[PDB]
Design a protein around this nucleic acid. Structure first.
Ligand SMILES: [Mg+2]
Ligand SMILES: [Mg+2]
Ligand SMILES: [Mg+2]
Ligand SMILES: [Mg+2]
Ligand SMILES: [Mg+2]
Ligand SMILES: [Mg+2]
Ligand SMILES: [Mg+2]
Ligand SMILES: [Mg+2]
Ligand SMILES: [Mg+2]
Ligand SMILES: [Mg+2]
Ligand SMILES: [Mg+2]
Ligand SMILES: [Mg+2]
Lengths: 52, 154, 118, 176, 138, 326
RNA sequence: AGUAUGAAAAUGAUUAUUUUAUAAGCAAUCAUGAAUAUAUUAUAUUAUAUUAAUGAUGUACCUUUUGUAUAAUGGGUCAGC
RNA sequence: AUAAUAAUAAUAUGGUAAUAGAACAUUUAAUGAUAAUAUAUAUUAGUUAUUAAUUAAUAUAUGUAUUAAUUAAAUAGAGAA
C-alpha cells in the first residue's frame, strides 16, 4: 500500500486507487441529486406560474 | 466514403447452375450501364442470362423505389457465390468404377452505383492522382542508392 | 600546418574513428554505432580524440590522430536501443530439428553537436 | 595562395574498373598534413563559401584574397548560348519619342499587317522592345487567346499530359 | 522576381540543448498475483526513490491494476514502449526499467550493412560528375 | 442522506478554482509534472514553479454559448474559469515578440542579402505556430483532456491539474469525424504555441538583469538549433533578367551564358554545362538536359550565390542594398 | 444426426492497391528504386505496411541410406482425431 | 561460506544415433482476490532476446475467469503411418 509520500522525491507519485465501481456509484448519486434539484426547481416554477 | 455513395444491392435466388458457367457471362457485364447489361442478357443465348436479367430488373426497380433513376445506374460489381447444399450422387461407371456427380446451385449478387456521384468521384480522384504525378526529368535526381561506407569516393 | 582554408569555410566534414570504425559526419548528423556503450550514458557528451580527416569542399586536413588542439568535434549520446528482432532458422537437409538463432543486437545513437576548427 | 600537395580521391584498387567499391578508399591512407582536393563536382545547387565567386563576396571578407573559387574554364573559348543580338552587339537607344508614338499608333491600327517582327525590321529594334512600348488592340489579343484555346482542345490526351510534365520540369529547374 | 516556397525546420535533439527522450514511466502492479511479486518488491525497496533522485527529468507513476505487472514508458517523440514484467524478480525489473530509460522512443527497425550515419545536410563536397572529374574516362 | 455528494464535488471545484486563481507556490512545488518539465529544459532556478504553472494557463474567462450546443458539436467541460490577472496572455505576447526579434536577427546574421519574402518564409519556418506546437509536444506539455467531474471522481490533487496545460478545449470535437470550426482560442496547437512563448517570456523576466543574453542562448539551443536549408526556400520567375539587373547595379560586366561542356546532344537525355561569365569571373555554373534549361539553371545558381552569401563572424557586419527589382 | 453461435482454414467469384506482354528455373532471403495506404508530435528531407522494377544469393520437405535436387519412400489442400 | 543482478580475465558453446539438464503452450483438481473503465476470443499495428506474454485500436460475446501463482496430474503439442 504505497503513497506518494513514501517515495521521498517529487517526481515519484502514486495515482489513487479508487475502485471504478465506487466512482461510478458516486457519479450516479451526483446525477440523482442534480435531478432532484433542477426538477424540483422546475416544478416550483410551474406552481408559481399556475398561481399567477 | 465508399459505403455512403448511393448504391443498390440486388440478389438472385438459388440458381441451378455452376459458378464457372455464371461467371462466364458475368465477366461480360463488368462496368456496364444497367440497361445495356439487361439488353445484353436478353440476347445472350445462355440459360443463366435470363435469371441475371431478371435480377438486374429487380435492382433497377429497387433503385427507382428508393431514389435513383434507371439511366444513372451502372453495374459497379457483380459476382457469383456458391449457394448452400449441393447434393452429391454416385455415378456408376463400367467395371467397378465409381464417380461422384454433384449438382451445383449458385447465386448472383450485384451492386449498382450511380454514374452521377460515384463514377464522377473516381474520375476526380484519378485526375488528382495525375496532377500529383511527378514529371519524367531527363537528369532527375535519382538517389545514389547504397551505403556510403564512411568514406568519400569523390 | 596552415589550417586557414578549413577555418574560413562554412561547411565542414570529419571522419572520426570509434574503435577503428570510420564514420564520416557533419554537424547535426546522427551516428548509429553498432554496439552498446558502457562508458557513456544518455545525455553524456563525447569529445572525439581520433579524427582521421577534416575536410572542406576543396581542402582536407589529414593524419593519424590529428591534434585535438586543431579542432573541436563533440557528440552527445541520445539513445541506447536495439535493432529489430529476428529469428533466422538453422537446420540441415534431412533432419527435423531446427535451431532458432535469435538476434537483437544493440545500438548506441550519437548526435554530432559541435564540429568546428579551434 | 597555398602551396599544398593536391590529390585525387584515391583508391588502392583500379579506379577504372572498381570506383564504386568503398573498401579500397578506406584502405588508402595518405601522409599526415594538409591537402588540396578539387571537388569532382559541379557547383550548381551549392551555397558553399568555396563555391561563391569573388565578385559576390564583400570587399573585406578574407576569402576574396584566397584562391578556391578557381577559374578553371576560360571565357574566350566557350560559345555564346541562347543569347540576344543586343548582347553580341551593344544595346541601342536611337529611337525617339515621335517614332515610338507612331509605332504605337500602327500597333493600335493593324496588328496582322504591322506585327512585332515587321516593326522590328522597320526600326532596327527588338520585338521585345516593341512589345514593351506598345499594346495591340485588345480584340486581337482575345482572338489569339481563342485560337490558343482551340489548339489546346485539339490536343490528344497524351500530349496534354506531356505538356503538363514539361511545365512541371520547367518549374523545378528554377529551384536549385 | 523571387518567390518564397514555404517549409519548416527539422528538430535536431542534441545540437543545441538536449531534451531527455524518456518523460514518464508508469510502474504498474497488482497486490494479488504471484506474477507481480518482483514488481511489488521493487516498489517496496527504496530503489524507486534512488532512481527518482538520479533522474528528475522523468516522472514515475505508480498504478494498481488487476493484471500482470507492467512498465509502460512514454517518450518525447510520442511513442510508448510497454514491457510486461511477468514473474520477474527485483533486479530483472530494475534492468528492464534501465533499458526503457536508455532507449529513445523510436520504433525498432532492421539496419543494413554499414548504414551508420543519418544526415539531412547536403554533401559538403558535391555529388560526383563525369564532366567535372579530375580524371576523364579514357 | 448521510452523504451530500453534490456538495463535496462543489467544494472540490471551488478549491480547484481558488488554486488556479492563486497558483500557490507550495502546490506548484508538490506537482511532479511541472518539476519534471523544469528539469528537462534546464531552466534557471530563479524561475519559480508558480510561474511555470501560469505559463501553462491560457486565458479562459467566461464559458461561451457554443457550450450549450453539444447537440450541435461542441462541449467544454474540462476547463475552470481562470484569473484575469494571472493568465499566460501577457507573457505570450512578449515571448512572440522575442521570437520575432531574435530569430530574425539570427537569420540576418547568417544570410545578409536574403530577399525579404524568403527571409519571412524562413522566419515562419523557424517559429510558425505548428512548429511551436510540435516543440511543446516534444517538451511534454500535455493538455487537460479530463473533465473536472472525472478528476474529482478519480480523487486526484490540484497539483496534477496545475501541471497540465489549461485552455478551453472542446471535449468531443473530433468524434464521428465531425469537427466544429471555431476561432484560434480553442485550438490545441495555438495553445501549445502560446505556452512555449510564455515559457520564453518567463525566462526573460527572470534573467533580465543577472544575465541578459541567457534567454537568447536558450532560444538558440532550442529554436535556432533546428535545421532549415535556405536553398530550398527560393523560386525564381525569369532569373536571367534579375541577374543582369544585379550585374548592372554592381560593378560587373554584362553576364553572358556560354557552353563549357556538352554530351549526348541528339538524345533522350543530353547534358549541357553552361557557365554565366562576367568577363572572366564565372558567376554561375548550370547543367541541363536542354541548352535553355542549362542557361536558366546557371542564372538561378548565380542568384543563389548572390543571396545566400554567409559571411564570417570575423567580418564587419555586412548590409545588403536590399533585393534586386525588375 | 442435440440447440444456439461461427471474421477457422482449405475452396469460388468480385473489387481495390501494386507489379506484370524481350522474359527461363523450390517462387524465398538479402540488397534496392518506384508506386500506393495508414498514422490527433509527418516539425520533415517523417515512420510503418503493402507491392515479382532491378541486382545478388538460393537443387522443396520427410523417410531410408555409404550416399538423394534426385528420375528412391510418402503426402491433392485444409480442419478434427 | 547464500541468493539475485552487474563487472573484469580466461576457457567453452556444429551435430545424426544417443545421454544429461531447464523451460513454455493446452486441459483437468486443490488454494484463490478482482470486475461491463471488466473479461474471453479474434484482426491489425506496436513492446519484451519473443513456440510466449503483453500494449493500443477495432469486432463479438459474457453480469463475468478453475483468472495470477504454487502444487498435483494428464486422452499435454502433428506436414509426414
Ligand atoms: Mg451455412
Ligand atoms: Mg458409362
Ligand atoms: Mg468433382
Ligand atoms: Mg543424411
Ligand atoms: Mg529441416
Ligand atoms: Mg573487378
Ligand atoms: Mg546433393
Ligand atoms: Mg504420390
Ligand atoms: Mg551443442
Ligand atoms: Mg494426443
Ligand atoms: Mg492438423
Ligand atoms: Mg512442424
Amino acid at each position: 500500500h504505497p503513497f506518494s509520500d513514501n517515495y521521498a522525491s517529487p517526481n515519484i507519485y502514486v495515482v489513487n486507487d479508487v475502485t471504478s465501481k465506487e466512482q461510478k456509484s458516486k457519479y450516479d448519486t451526483i446525477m440523482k441529486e442534480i435531478q432532484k434539484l433542477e426538477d424540483d426547481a422546475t416544478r416550483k416554477a410551474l406552481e408559481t406560474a399556475r398561481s399567477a | 466514403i465508399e459505403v455512403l455513395e448511393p448504391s443498390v444491392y440486388a440478389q438472385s435466388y438459388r440458381i441451378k447452375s455452376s459458378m464457372k458457367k455464371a461467371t462466364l457471362l458475368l465477366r461480360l457485364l463488368g462496368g456496364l450501364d444497367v440497361m445495356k447489361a439487361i439488353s445484353q442478357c436478353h440476347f445472350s443465348n445462355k440459360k443463366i442470362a435470363r435469371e441475371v436479367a431478371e435480377l438486374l430488373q429487380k435492382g433497377v426497380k429497387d433503385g427507382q423505389k428508393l431514389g435513383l433513376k434507371p439511366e444513372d445506374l451502372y453495374i459497379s460489381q457483380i459476382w457469383t457465390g456458391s449457394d448452400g447444399f449441393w447434393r452429391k450422387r454416385v455415378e456408376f461407371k463400367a467395371r467397378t468404377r465409381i464417380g461422384i456427380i454433384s449438382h451445383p446451385y449458385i447465386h448472383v449478387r450485384c451492386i449498382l452505383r450511380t454514374k452521377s456521384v460515384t463514377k464522377r468521384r473516381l474520375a476526380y480522384e484519378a485526375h488528382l492522382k495525375e496532377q500529383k504525378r511527378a514529371p519524367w526529368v531527363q537528369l532527375g535526381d535519382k538517389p545514389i542508392r547504397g551505403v556510403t561506407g564512411g568514406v568519400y569516393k569523390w | 600546418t596552415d589550417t586557414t582554408p578549413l577555418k574560413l569555410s562554412n561547411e565542414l566534414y570529419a571522419i572520426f574513428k570509434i574503435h577503428n570504425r570510420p564514420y564520416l559526419v557533419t554537424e547535426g548528423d546522427r551516428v548509429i554505432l553498432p554496439f552498446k556503450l558502457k562508458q557513456a550514458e544518455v545525455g553524456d557528451i563525447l569529445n572525439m580524440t581520433d579524427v582521421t580527416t577534416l575536410g572542406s569542399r576543396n581542402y582536407k586536413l589529414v593524419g593519424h590522430p590529428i591534434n585535438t588542439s586543431l579542432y573541436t568535434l563533440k557528440a552527445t549520446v541520445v539513445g541506447k536501443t536495439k535493432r529489430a528482432f529476428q529469428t533466422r532458422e538453422v537446420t540441415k537437409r534431412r533432419n527435423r530439428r531446427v535451431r532458432h538463432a535469435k538476434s537483437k543486437g544493440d545500438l548506441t545513437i550519437l548526435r554530432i553537436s559541435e564540429l568546428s576548427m579551434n | 595562395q597555398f602551396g599544398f600537395p593536391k590529390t585525387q580521391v584515391t583508391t588502392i584498387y583500379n579506379k577504372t574498373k572498381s570506383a564504386s567499391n568503398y573498401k579500397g578508399y578506406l584502405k588508402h591512407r595518405d601522409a599526415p598534413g594538409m591537402y588540396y582536393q578539387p571537388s569532382e563536382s559541379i557547383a550548381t545547387g551549392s551555397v558553399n563559401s568555396e563555391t561563391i565567386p569573388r565578385s559576390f563576396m564583400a570587399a573585406s571578407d578574407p576569402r576574396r584574397g584566397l584562391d578556391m573559387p578557381v577559374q578553371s574554364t576560360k571565357a574566350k573559348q566557350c560559345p555564346n548560348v541562347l543569347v540576344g543580338k543586343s548582347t553580341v552587339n551593344g544595346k541601342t537607344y536611337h529611337l525617339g519619342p515621335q517614332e515610338i508614338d507612331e509605332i504605337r499608333k500602327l500597333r493600335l491600327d493593324n496588328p496582322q499587317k504591322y506585327t512585332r517582327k515587321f516593326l522590328a525590321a522597320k526600326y532596327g529594334i527588338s520585338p521585345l522592345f516593341v512589345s514593351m512600348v506598345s499594346k495591340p488592340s485588345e480584340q486581337h489579343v482575345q482572338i489569339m487567346e481563342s485560337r490558343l484555346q482551340e489548339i489546346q482542345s485539339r490536343w490528344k490526351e497524351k500530349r496534354r499530359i506531356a505538356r503538363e510534365d514539361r511545365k512541371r520540369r520547367k518549374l523545378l529547374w528554377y529551384q536549385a | 522576381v523571387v518567390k518564397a516556397i514555404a517549409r519548416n525546420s527539422i528538430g535536431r535533439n542534441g545540437v543545441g540543448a538536449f531534451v531527455f527522450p524518456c518523460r514518464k514511466i508508469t510502474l504498474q502492479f497488482c497486490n494479488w498475483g504471484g506474477s507481480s511479486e518482483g514488481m511489488r518488491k521493487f516498489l517496496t525497496s527504496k530503489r524507486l526513490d534512488k532512481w527518482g533522485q538520479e533522474f528528475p527529468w522523468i516522472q514515475f507513476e505508480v498504478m494498481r491494476k488487476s493484471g500482470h505487472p507492467l512498465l509502460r514508458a512514454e517518450y518525447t517523440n510520442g511513442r510508448e514502449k510497454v514491457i510486461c514484467v511477468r514473474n520477474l524478480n527485483i533486479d530483472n525489473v530494475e534492468n528492464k526499467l534501465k533499458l526503457l530509460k536508455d532507449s529513445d522512443g523510436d520504433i525498432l527497425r532492421r539496419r543494413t550493412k554499414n548504414d551508420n550515419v543519418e544526415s539531412l545536410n547536403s554533401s559538403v563536397r558535391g555529388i560526383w560528375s563525369p564532366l567535372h572529374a579530375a580524371k576523364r574516362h579514357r | 442522506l448521510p452523504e451530500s455528494e453534490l456538495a463535496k464535488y462543489k467544494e472540490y471545484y471551488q478549491g480547484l478554482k481558488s488554486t488556479v486563481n492563486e497558483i500557490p507556490e507550495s502546490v506548484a512545488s508538490k506537482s511532479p509534472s511541472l518539476r519534471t518539465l523544469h528539469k528537462r529544459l534546464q531552466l534557471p532556478n530563479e524561475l519559480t514553479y508558480s510561474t511555470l504553472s501560469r505559463c501553462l494557463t491560457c486565458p479562459s474567462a467566461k464559458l461561451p454559448d457554443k457550450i450549450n450546443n453539444p447537440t450541435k458539436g461542441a462541449a467544454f467541460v474540462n476547463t475552470v474559469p481562470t484569473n484575469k490577472y494571472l493568465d499566460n496572455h501577457g507573457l505570450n505576447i512578449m515571448g512572440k515578440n522575442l521570437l520575432s526579434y531574435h530569430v530574425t536577427k539570427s537569420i540576418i546574421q547568417k544570410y545578409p542579402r536574403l530577399p525579404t519574402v524568403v527571409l519571412n518564409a524562413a522566419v515562419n519556418a523557424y517559429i510558425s505556430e505548428a512548429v511551436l506546437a510540435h516543440i511543446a509536444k516534444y517538451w511534454g506539455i500535455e493538455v487537460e483532456t479530463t473533465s473536472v467531474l472525472s478528476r474529482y471522481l478519480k480523487m486526484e490533487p490540484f497539483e496534477f491539474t496545475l501541471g497540465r496545460l489549461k485552455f478551453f478545449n472542446n471535449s468531443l470535437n473530433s468524434k464521428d469525424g465531425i469537427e466544429l470550426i471555431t476561432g484560434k482560442n480553442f485550438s490545441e496547437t495555438s495553445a501549445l504555441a502560446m505556452s512555449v512563448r510564455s515559457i520564453i517570456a518567463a525566462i526573460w523576466a527572470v534573467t533580465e538583469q543577472k544575465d541578459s543574453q541567457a534567454v537568447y542562448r536558450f532560444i538558440d539551443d532550442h529554436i535556432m538549433s533546428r535545421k532549415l536549408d535556405i536553398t530550398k526556400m527560393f523560386q525564381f520567375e525569369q532569373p536571367t533578367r534579375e541577374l543582369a539587373m544585379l550585374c548592372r547595379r554592381e560593378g560587373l560586366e554584362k553576364p553572358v551564358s556560354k557552353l563549357v561542356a556538352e554530351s549526348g546532344r541528339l538524345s533522350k537525355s543530353p547534358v549541357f554545362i553552361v557557365h554565366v561569365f562576367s568577363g572572366e569571373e564565372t558567376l554561375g555554373e548550370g547543367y541541363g538536359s536542354s541548352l535553355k534549361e542549362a542557361k536558366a539553371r546557371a542564372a538561378t545558381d548565380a542568384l543563389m550565390k548572390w543571396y545566400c552569401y554567409e559571411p564570417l563572424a570575423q567580418q564587419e557586419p555586412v548590409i545588403d542594398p536590399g533585393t534586386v527589382v525588375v
